[PDB]
Design an enzyme around this catalytic site. Sequence first.
Site, PDB file in Angstrom:
ATOM      1  CG  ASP A   1       1.596   3.818   8.565  1.00 42.81           C
ATOM      2  OD1 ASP A   1       2.409   2.966   8.277  1.00 42.81           O
ATOM      3  OD2 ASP A   1       0.446   3.916   8.109  1.00 42.81           O
TER       4      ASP A   1
ATOM      5  CE  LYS B   1      -4.975   5.572   8.631  1.00 40.36           C
ATOM      6  NZ  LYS B   1      -4.472   6.583   7.445  1.00 40.36           N
ATOM      7  CG  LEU B   2     -10.340   0.815  12.437  1.00 46.16           C
ATOM      8  CD1 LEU B   2     -11.594   0.225  11.630  1.00 46.16           C
ATOM      9  CD2 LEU B   2     -10.174   0.474  13.950  1.00 46.16           C
TER      10      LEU B   2
ATOM     11  CB  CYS C   1       4.546   0.081   2.198  1.00 41.65           C
ATOM     12  SG  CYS C   1       5.267  -1.040   3.306  1.00 41.65           S
TER      13      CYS C   1
ATOM     14  N   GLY D   1       1.026   5.409   1.806  1.00 40.43           N
ATOM     15  CA  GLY D   1       0.526   6.403   2.634  1.00 40.43           C
ATOM     16  C   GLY D   1       1.485   7.667   2.707  1.00 40.43           C
TER      17      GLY D   1
ATOM     18  N   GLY E   1       0.767  -1.342   0.001  1.00 36.27           N
ATOM     19  CA  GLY E   1       0.183  -0.153  -0.038  1.00 36.27           C
ATOM     20  C   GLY E   1       0.862   1.230   0.090  1.00 36.27           C
TER      21      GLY E   1
ATOM     22  CG  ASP F   1      -3.017   9.628  11.156  1.00 33.62           C
ATOM     23  OD1 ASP F   1      -4.158   9.939  11.329  1.00 33.62           O
ATOM     24  OD2 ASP F   1      -2.520   9.162  10.133  1.00 33.62           O
TER      25      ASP F   1
ATOM     26  CE  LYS G   1       5.381   3.326   6.382  1.00 31.49           C
ATOM     27  NZ  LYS G   1       5.619   3.803   7.668  1.00 31.49           N
TER      28      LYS G   1
HETATM   29  C1  LIG Z   1       1.595  -7.776   4.630  1.00 33.61           C
HETATM   30  C2  LIG Z   1       0.595  -6.668   4.715  1.00 33.61           C
HETATM   31  N1  LIG Z   1      -0.388  -6.802   3.825  1.00 33.61           N
HETATM   32  C3  LIG Z   1      -1.129  -5.665   3.664  1.00 33.61           C
HETATM   33  C4  LIG Z   1      -1.425  -4.704   4.561  1.00 33.61           C
HETATM   34  C5  LIG Z   1      -2.646  -3.811   4.456  1.00 33.61           C
HETATM   35  C6  LIG Z   1      -2.096  -2.568   3.704  1.00 33.61           C
HETATM   36  C7  LIG Z   1      -3.255  -1.535   3.453  1.00 33.61           C
HETATM   37  N2  LIG Z   1      -4.047  -1.103   4.745  1.00 33.61           N
HETATM   38  C8  LIG Z   1      -3.162  -0.591   5.919  1.00 33.61           C
HETATM   39  C9  LIG Z   1      -5.111  -0.297   4.463  1.00 33.61           C
HETATM   40  C10 LIG Z   1      -0.506  -4.754   5.349  1.00 33.61           C
HETATM   41  C11 LIG Z   1       0.466  -5.728   5.711  1.00 33.61           C
HETATM   42  N3  LIG Z   1       1.348  -5.512   6.600  1.00 33.61           N
HETATM   43  C12 LIG Z   1       2.153  -4.769   6.922  1.00 33.61           C
HETATM   44  N4  LIG Z   1       3.124  -4.875   7.691  1.00 33.61           N
HETATM   45  C13 LIG Z   1       3.946  -3.684   8.257  1.00 33.61           C
HETATM   46  C14 LIG Z   1       4.018  -2.486   7.451  1.00 33.61           C
HETATM   47  C15 LIG Z   1       2.799  -2.494   6.606  1.00 33.61           C
HETATM   48  N5  LIG Z   1       1.930  -3.430   6.409  1.00 33.61           N
HETATM   49  C16 LIG Z   1       2.429  -1.463   6.025  1.00 33.61           C
HETATM   50  C17 LIG Z   1       1.618  -1.566   4.478  1.00 33.61           C
HETATM   51  C18 LIG Z   1       1.164  -0.348   3.959  1.00 33.61           C
HETATM   52  C19 LIG Z   1       1.484   0.725   4.436  1.00 33.61           C
HETATM   53 CL1  LIG Z   1       0.860   2.357   3.486  1.00 33.61          CL
HETATM   54  C20 LIG Z   1       2.099   1.222   5.676  1.00 33.61           C
HETATM   55  C21 LIG Z   1       2.444   0.189   6.334  1.00 33.61           C
HETATM   56  N6  LIG Z   1       3.194   0.296   7.500  1.00 33.61           N
HETATM   57  C22 LIG Z   1       4.301  -0.106   8.060  1.00 33.61           C
HETATM   58  S1  LIG Z   1       4.635   0.476   9.528  1.00 33.61           S
HETATM   59  C23 LIG Z   1       4.741  -1.507   7.823  1.00 33.61           C
END
Ligand SMILES: Cc1ncc(CCCN(C)C)cc1Nc1ncc2c(n1)-c1ccc(Cl)cc1NC(=S)C2
Length: 287
Positions: free
Chosen positions: A153, A137-138, A26, A21, A19, A135, A41
């Site tokens: 984040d 949030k879910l 990321c 942000g 995703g 910030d 990131k």
């Molecule tokens: C493995 C995995 N797959 C999908 C998602 C969902 C991303 C979108 N959701 C937050 C709206 C999360 C993860 N795990 C996962 N694990 C660690 C991180 C992230 N996501 C992550 C991912 C996207 C963004 Cl924009 C920031 C972000 N931030 C940090 S601190 C590291």
Amino acid sequence: EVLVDPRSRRRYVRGRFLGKGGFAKCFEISDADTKEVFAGKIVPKSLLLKPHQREKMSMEISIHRSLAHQHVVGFHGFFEDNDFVFVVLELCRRRSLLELHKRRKALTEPEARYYLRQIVLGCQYLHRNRVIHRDLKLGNLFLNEDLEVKIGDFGLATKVEYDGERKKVLCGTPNYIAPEVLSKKGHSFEVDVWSIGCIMYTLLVGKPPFETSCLKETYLRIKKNEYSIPKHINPVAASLIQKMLQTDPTARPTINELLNDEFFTSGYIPARLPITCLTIPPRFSIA
Ligand SMILES: Cc1ncc(CCCN(C)C)cc1Nc1ncc2c(n1)-c1ccc(Cl)cc1NC(=S)C2
Ligand SMILES: [Zn+2]
């Protein structure tokens, strides 16, 4: 495709996109030697032409790297080339509360207690370290394989530098934004407790406290405190939400008080949750 650290001689393959942000894209990444798996990131320098922009990125890393706790996304390192900034973080394989919420809508009380407890534990750590996330949030609240919660984040986080400090501006727009930020009345820790209120509400109810079709109308309601808790929500929960969603920030409870609310002390908090619970509401049967 490949990503190399000079100072640590470590190289990472770039995997699937997770995703975006702010200025960051990321990706899932893996170390070419240990095959160990991380969250990467990747921020383009093309977007850090200006000093103000560059300092935030620099502050984010300063704050994040200063953090080690069970419920905060583990910081692992950073490096750069001429085109991009690269930050290496814990990969949370089970995504975020946000994906969970879109699949399951309102959770059961004891699921909410579980997650909420961990969130408040992560936040207690921040606050004792003079750090405000600003910030929560879910989408920020991440889940490892054991469905443990990791706050991530830190791009709107600020460090408190002295006692009784009142931050005057917030650069960027939080999701669960405290009324005192909106009124530009100055702000401190109570903004995180504010967000948690909205998150509790959202997990218990299946929709955010102050939602409208206009963000600016939402902002209006947040000023006027216009939200209702439905009558099917338990009054011990309702009391907590009500306590945390107060316009006057001096009234809201501190982070350290929260775990000693009837809602945690006189209610069932699972030791753990099964994966099943990502998709299917746990009945919590005795056998
Ligand atoms: C493995 C995995 N797959 C999908 C998602 C969902 C991303 C979108 N959701 C937050 C709206 C999360 C993860 N795990 C996962 N694990 C660690 C991180 C992230 N996501 C992550 C991912 C996207 C963004 Cl924009 C920031 C972000 N931030 C940090 S601190 C590291
Ligand atoms: Zn600015």
